[PDB]
Write a protein that binds this ligand. Sequence first.
Ligand SMILES: *[C@@H]1O[C@H](CO)[C@@H](O[C@@H]2O[C@H](CO)[C@@H](O)[C@H](O)[C@H]2NC(C)=O)[C@H](O)[C@H]1NC(C)=O
Ligand SMILES: *[C@@H]1O[C@H](CO)[C@@H](O[C@@H]2O[C@H](CO)[C@@H](O)[C@H](O)[C@H]2NC(C)=O)[C@H](O)[C@H]1NC(C)=O
Ligand SMILES: C[C@H]1CC(C)(C)N(C(=O)CN2C(=O)c3ccccc3C2=O)c2ccccc21
Ligand SMILES: C[C@H]1CC(C)(C)N(C(=O)CN2C(=O)c3ccccc3C2=O)c2ccccc21
Ligand SMILES: C[C@H]1CC(C)(C)N(C(=O)CN2C(=O)c3ccccc3C2=O)c2ccccc21
Ligand SMILES: C[C@H]1CC(C)(C)N(C(=O)CN2C(=O)c3ccccc3C2=O)c2ccccc21
Ligand code: NA
Ligand code: NA
Lengths: 467, 467, 467, 467
Amino acid sequence: DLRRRLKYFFMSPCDKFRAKGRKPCKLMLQVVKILVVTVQLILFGLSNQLVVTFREENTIAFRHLFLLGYSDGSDDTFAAYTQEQLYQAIFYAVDQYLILPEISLGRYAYVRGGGGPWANGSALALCQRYYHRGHVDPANDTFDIDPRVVTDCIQVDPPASYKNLTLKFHKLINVTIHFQLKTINLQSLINNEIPDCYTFSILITFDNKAHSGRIPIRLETKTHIQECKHPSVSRSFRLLFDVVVILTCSLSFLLCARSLLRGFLLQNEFVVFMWRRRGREISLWERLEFVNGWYILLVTSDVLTISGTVMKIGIEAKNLASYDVCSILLGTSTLLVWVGVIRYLTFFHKYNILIATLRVALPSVMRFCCCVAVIYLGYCFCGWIVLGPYHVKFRSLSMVSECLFSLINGDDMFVTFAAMQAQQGHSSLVWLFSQLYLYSFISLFIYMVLSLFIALITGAYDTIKHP
Amino acid sequence: DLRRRLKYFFMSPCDKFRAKGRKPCKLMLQVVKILVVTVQLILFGLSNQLVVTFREENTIAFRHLFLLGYSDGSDDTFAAYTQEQLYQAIFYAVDQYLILPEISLGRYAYVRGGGGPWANGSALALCQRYYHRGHVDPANDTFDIDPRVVTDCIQVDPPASYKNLTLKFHKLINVTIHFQLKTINLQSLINNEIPDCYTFSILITFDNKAHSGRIPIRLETKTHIQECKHPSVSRSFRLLFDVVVILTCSLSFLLCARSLLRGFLLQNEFVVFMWRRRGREISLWERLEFVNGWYILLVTSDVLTISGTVMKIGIEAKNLASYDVCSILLGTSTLLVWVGVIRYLTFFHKYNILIATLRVALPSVMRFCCCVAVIYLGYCFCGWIVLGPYHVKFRSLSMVSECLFSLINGDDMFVTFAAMQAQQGHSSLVWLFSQLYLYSFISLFIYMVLSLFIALITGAYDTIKHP
Amino acid sequence: DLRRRLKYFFMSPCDKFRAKGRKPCKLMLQVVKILVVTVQLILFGLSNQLVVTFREENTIAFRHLFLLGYSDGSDDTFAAYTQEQLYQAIFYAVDQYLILPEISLGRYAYVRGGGGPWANGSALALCQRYYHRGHVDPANDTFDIDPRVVTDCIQVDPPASYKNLTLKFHKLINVTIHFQLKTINLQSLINNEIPDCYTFSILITFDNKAHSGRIPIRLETKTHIQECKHPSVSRSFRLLFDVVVILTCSLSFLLCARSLLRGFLLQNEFVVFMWRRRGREISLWERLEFVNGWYILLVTSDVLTISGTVMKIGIEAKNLASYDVCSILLGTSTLLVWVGVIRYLTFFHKYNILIATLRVALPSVMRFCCCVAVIYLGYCFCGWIVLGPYHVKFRSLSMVSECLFSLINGDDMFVTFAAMQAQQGHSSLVWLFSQLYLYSFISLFIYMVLSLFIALITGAYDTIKHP
Amino acid sequence: DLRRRLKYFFMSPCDKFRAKGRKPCKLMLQVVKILVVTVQLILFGLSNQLVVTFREENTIAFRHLFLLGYSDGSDDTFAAYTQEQLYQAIFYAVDQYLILPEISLGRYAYVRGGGGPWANGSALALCQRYYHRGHVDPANDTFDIDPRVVTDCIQVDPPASYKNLTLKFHKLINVTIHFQLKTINLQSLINNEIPDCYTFSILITFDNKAHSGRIPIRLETKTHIQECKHPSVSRSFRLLFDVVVILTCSLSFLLCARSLLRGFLLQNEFVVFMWRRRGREISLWERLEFVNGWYILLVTSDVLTISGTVMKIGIEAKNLASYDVCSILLGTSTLLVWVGVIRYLTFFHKYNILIATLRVALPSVMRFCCCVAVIYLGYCFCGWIVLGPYHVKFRSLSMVSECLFSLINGDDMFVTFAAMQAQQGHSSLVWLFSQLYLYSFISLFIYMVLSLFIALITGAYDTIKHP
Ligand SMILES: *[C@@H]1O[C@H](CO)[C@@H](O[C@@H]2O[C@H](CO)[C@@H](O)[C@H](O)[C@H]2NC(C)=O)[C@H](O)[C@H]1NC(C)=O
Ligand SMILES: *[C@@H]1O[C@H](CO)[C@@H](O[C@@H]2O[C@H](CO)[C@@H](O)[C@H](O)[C@H]2NC(C)=O)[C@H](O)[C@H]1NC(C)=O
Ligand SMILES: C[C@H]1CC(C)(C)N(C(=O)CN2C(=O)c3ccccc3C2=O)c2ccccc21
Ligand SMILES: C[C@H]1CC(C)(C)N(C(=O)CN2C(=O)c3ccccc3C2=O)c2ccccc21
Ligand SMILES: C[C@H]1CC(C)(C)N(C(=O)CN2C(=O)c3ccccc3C2=O)c2ccccc21
Ligand SMILES: C[C@H]1CC(C)(C)N(C(=O)CN2C(=O)c3ccccc3C2=O)c2ccccc21
Ligand code: NA
Ligand code: NA
């Protein structure tokens, strides 16, 4: 019961081969797997980029075609301030829709019945929504509101009545123009793909929910991709390459599972042996240590890779169009595959500084982060509610977190101060509070929190560095 | 006189319970208090954001309605350079005021007698201010000025004479157009609130105080919020939740006060005992140490929370409209409540690195800051007066401080240099001085001051870290 | 010969008083001197800001009055691309000059004979400069140039011939329009000052020196300030306060000189004594050490303060108008006065960390900087010549230095890369070189140079810190 | 066999002279070489800047002359959205070309036969490219495409038919307008150079490859520089100075080669001696160490300098016009020459901190970088494919690398987050992935990777610092 096997288990592939004539199959697979997974990622990215561009470019074209006086870059300030301006914008949108085929550079088809729920079979719906009862009378400081929402729709069919529109401004909530357009993404031919049919759902909103004398106007689109009914192109190895990637990932999965099982059985044998030699129920954290975390990482990376590859095959077969989910799966798998090659550098301590440090430092780092997180969250909520109405970088919780995290790393500091300087928070009290808030957060987190964090990490390194 | 009580006083809640069967009431209150205070903060923020948006959006609408040729973003460069331009801008403002009801998207009411002190009961006042005597004659290098200010006002009433305005350009100081508009913030219905009446005081200024051939034009508003006289909405737990928050905070206050008193009495007993056993008047800094700073922090946090909650109740009852003060109170209380939970991590030294370091390092840090502050203030004053006229980031003292503080953290460096590069300070001497100023400040504070500060903090950490 | 005097010389003011009943006159002067110098700086800054604003605002007004189609912010791209555009711009400038009094918001006077050297007594000179001989014939790839510059001027007098202007485009070098305007800076009355007469020399340049089909157009001004011949204002302590500042600075100067002399005499006595007791010519660096550098700093600060104060008196007396030099003197003196108060913190080692560190670290820091400076200068020259034509941040040597210095501190990195990304240097070779240049400079200086610099500074601190 | 020669070999120039009366010729050459190489670099930069400006300014002029409604700064958003807009832009370009001589401020000559391959001897070619067969019918979800590209060109000759252009929009790929213009860079006379003939190849592209309803329009130029056939200027030491630089560099090369040979021979002699005294084949890494890396650096720097100087002579002689390659050679040589002077500071250890540290730290640094590079590359590929379609900073691989490298140094953090905030990736899944990606990358690389890197560098410094 010398158990030299337990010695051969924790052996570098070079030592595993000098000792037992064992070809490093897993090491060779990783390099080939890295190459094939990265190549597959790039190949998918070609068509993914084509799709995203098509959607974005069409949206910009719609904004230039339907939004009166639209100019690039003014998406957040585009608004109407006069009754005449609002009427002109609405009528311009409808008129441009009605003459689209004669003007548009793209080849768009109308969608009969695409006007939405309010379009009773019409292509375009022009809905205005107002309170059921509204009697705003600021002169007498009096109002009488029935906040029930009434929807009034005008049906527009491509080849008028919509010109007779009268807007109830004093109680208007919003006006919307819903219509759908069909077009074919021909550019996919460059990738030797068959073009799909894209249906864009276009929603133009004139938003008066604030009743503030300023009515923002925006255009939004939703895209639906589907195979064309009758495609004909007079014109690859992509499917074969995806099958190859699946083969490599399946082989690596099999090898990793076999190694994990062998390690678990060795753990059981060792544990029962130590129970014989010394006392029983003696090993605990060690039973855990008998596992290889890198083999778990590889197993989960190749599972993600197989899922992404199957999804890529489905998208190319036109069974599904979820390019975002597939791109995310393939990119995460590529990153994990690149990371996995560090497993073979963990044997030589000269190249293993990063991982050894991480292993030593993570418990203290997590204990530190526990304390630092409550302070961070308190600051986040405080800033979000107090400064969010006044500060453009504190509008939402995620935005506040991004702002504070970038401030911790010394980024965009003066711009953060200047945002409050420019408007003074329309209240010296808010400005003074922002001064105290920003100075205290920056000083605390840059000089104490970050200094202590770094000190913990470098202390862990000093612990693993032999000197 | 073993005084195991003095042992039970400085005990962790887990130890306080394993020893005396004591339920950690304060620990449980903190979590519940955290939750309820944060929820209340968010709930208040809903309506606070509604109010701030209403004010800002109305101001933008006014700028588009009354400022001739106004475009978004040009607030600091909007100005007139010709007599005709100034006349056209003034007359455009008045004309737009006179036809407001027919054009405005918002529902505004005039305010008869709102023209201000210069409007003798008129709705709009159009005042021009000029020197009592002014005989500027640059051709003969001669002038004769009586700098007494004369105000001449034209009364405008909504349904002319103001068209006959003649401006004394050579001695004009400024022209102002004061009027008031009433509107109802209907959007508050989404929060199940009763809309208020907002009165906006609008002041348009054509400023010629510089006599420089360029007359900046700006629009400012003041807002006054009050309950409507006759509201009617055909349509919550907010008051009940505020009462709940008050209950939790009052209970925590009571517990903290009771604990503080118990600790003070224990301090007195211990001190008199040590006076018996050893010499008299022996304890000093220790008598102080017998206090818990966290219980003081909790007491002041719940006082702030109660004040903010009462103010929130008042605002919802429409007894007052001070959303900024209430928001500041609630946000500060939320931050303090989140911070207070670290009290229970100060018992375990593994999680107490930050606080222990702070405690060890603050005296040396403050002694260092004493010296660093005089240098910083000297630089601040120097930059403010020498570079403020030429540099857009040195305009005011607070702006100079923000600039220098962000420079210490390496932020917006090149933009700071480039501001002086672009104009060269219209004097090579000023440019050279700015070069020396910026290089010396940046080098000194980034490489010496900050290095020494960090070294002090990490030295304190090394002192409390057991290794 | 116990020389307790040499003990009393190196004594803190508190010790100097507990020992010899000596009131700390210098310590009290520093605080009062700080206060009065800062107040004087601010008071001067009021009028300095007024002057600078006047100049800048007038320049902007001129650009809007004389530059056809000018709009704020387009100062670097404002240019003509067509013969008609150039003619229209020139004629617009002249026409606006000719009707200035009827349109300008400022009160400007013409200057008869102000047209410059080319104006033979005329108010406006419109000069075009072209080669004496120019026969550019790109069709035959032939030219014949006599690069002698010929100046042709048209005289314009305010109440035509200039309308008959014909420009020799193929050989045109530039066109210039020179004229002068007089105006009175009335706003100075707010500071209770007598307004001065400002003469602006306006130069409009249509620059064709590049012969590139694009003719940049710019407006420049020079300002000359002088007292008005016949001022009359129907309407301070500033002179008295300046005399007070001079008094305080002179007293401090006297005390510092007396102390420096006493220290030098004590040095001589000690040195000769040590020559008696021990060998002769034994002391060297110590003779130097017997001097107080802070007393030298104070002496030079109060000299600067007196010079600045006398200059301020001169400017207020209207004997001179050099606000930039005076502002620089007063600001430097204010900074030095604030710094000087650290002298009294150098006695207590707890507050003297910064200065003691600096003293220990400066030799090693300077030896390090010697080596780092040659690398920095090599990079500066390389970047300036190779990348300056393509990169907007490398245009000039000072700009290159600012760019590299800010890069060392991690500032504006991505913008620096993106500048080269956007144009690709119109040559992949230049882009690749810029990649190597930026990556190598950033990596070297951030990770090695700065790390070593900080290590030297903190090592010096470790040397002076008692632990 | 005392071999004091081996002692005299590793001797500082001061010691080499105190011992053997040896004038430090190489040390003196370095200073003179530094001066002359830097001066030559600046002198070349004069003309290099002239050339680059000429090209850029002409390109901007062309964009203003030929692109309808072009305005500065809108290069990436300039596009057509309507059939009428596209026709107007095309016809405007052609019309402006046809009347160029009467309008252009520059003196341009037509190039007969310069229209390109599609111009059969014509000056201007106006080509439209469309699919051989295209039957896009989105209404029936059907298409029939023959993706063969058909080119149809219209020949335009300067002093119509091109007005009869009909564009097949449904199958249009792109339209291009190719023409050439000749002009003379007269500004070179300021450098006392003979102006060259520049031929600009202008390509205007209306790109419809995306078929997205938006057709970007761009103008590109290629420049060809050649000597004029018949130049005549009625009008330096540059060639003499270049010969001087060549002389200095050749002398330094000779001295460095002689020293390298002497060192190699000394290595051989020492090695064979040690083989006699002690065992044979004993020295290995030492034989390598017997070489001076600085002499290799100097040799390669002066080789680069000579190549650049010869190229500069060629360009001035008009035998070649490759200013970019010459500028790169001269700038790299200047940087290397400045760096080379550190060789004489490597003798004194007080000034040799940087180099000694680098020498000690490079092996550990490289081992660390090996591990860090796979993680970095994985992140780069992941970001490039997943976020590149949505994020403007992830468009290309080089751009992704610049973004991640600047993020490591804490640069442009909040802007990176905000880019994804603004559009939300049009998919909450993409936004969430970007959040995880950015947070994980920033945290890992700033807090662990960079901390460990710095710790390695400062540890190497601690190893070479005597304390
Ligand atoms: C226009 O206003 C109506 C009514 O205010 C909005 O309709 C609501 O939409 C939300 C989310 O789509 C639903 O949860 C509600 O049930 C709808 N009705 C009400 C009474 O709230 C509509 O969303 C607005 N349109 C746009 C484009 O914003
Ligand atoms: C227009 O100019 C007048 C006179 O210069 C300003 O009136 C002064 O305003 C300040 C602050 O409001 C008061 O302290 C003064 O008493 C007022 N009179 C004088 C003679 O100074 C007025 O503020 C200016 N208007 C605007 C909108 O700036
Ligand atoms: C960002 C990382 C590093 C460290 C220590 C600087 N740190 C904080 O400073 C506080 N803190 C958060 O709570 C947090 C939560 C989500 C995003 C970013 C942060 C964030 O910056 C922290 C705290 C908890 C978890 C991770 C971290
Ligand atoms: C900002 C904090 C950290 C530290 C040490 C970097 N530090 C300085 O560098 C000098 N300094 C001021 O005087 C100061 C005053 C107000 C705002 C910011 C500052 C500021 O940056 C300082 C000095 C005094 C009090 C606090 C601090
Ligand atoms: C800026 C300071 C700090 C330090 C060490 C970072 N450092 C360099 O990195 C190289 N370096 C110059 O040569 C230099 C010269 C002029 C302005 C800025 C610099 C500059 O950044 C340097 C070198 C010489 C003198 C001062 C310094
Ligand atoms: C930039 C230098 C310093 C250091 C250690 C921070 N480091 C990384 O963090 C990872 N890393 C790359 O892989 C890399 C490759 C190309 C450009 C920039 C980088 C880059 O930032 C790295 C890694 C390999 C080679 C050089 C370096
Ligand atoms: Na930055
Ligand atoms: Na930074």
